[PDB]
Ligand binder design. Sequence first.
Ligand code: ZN
Ligand code: ZN
Length: 75
Amino acid sequence: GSHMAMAYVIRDEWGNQIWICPGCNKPDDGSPMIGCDDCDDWYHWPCVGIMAAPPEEMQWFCPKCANKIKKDKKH
Ligand SMILES: [Zn+2]
Ligand SMILES: [Zn+2]
């Protein structure tokens, strides 16, 4: 069973998922959020360095999944 990943998850007033971006360790405190192409969860703009909304054709990966890209990407 998952012992971890129980946190970084808060419920909103309406019951929405408050994502705690594992990049900064902040929840949505009122920022624009961006989701990964490999993972399901959402990160924030300042954490990853988003200047403006990136293309959808582009596959965007957080510092976590960028590390999966690693160096040697085969995609
Ligand atoms: Zn963040
Ligand atoms: Zn990711």
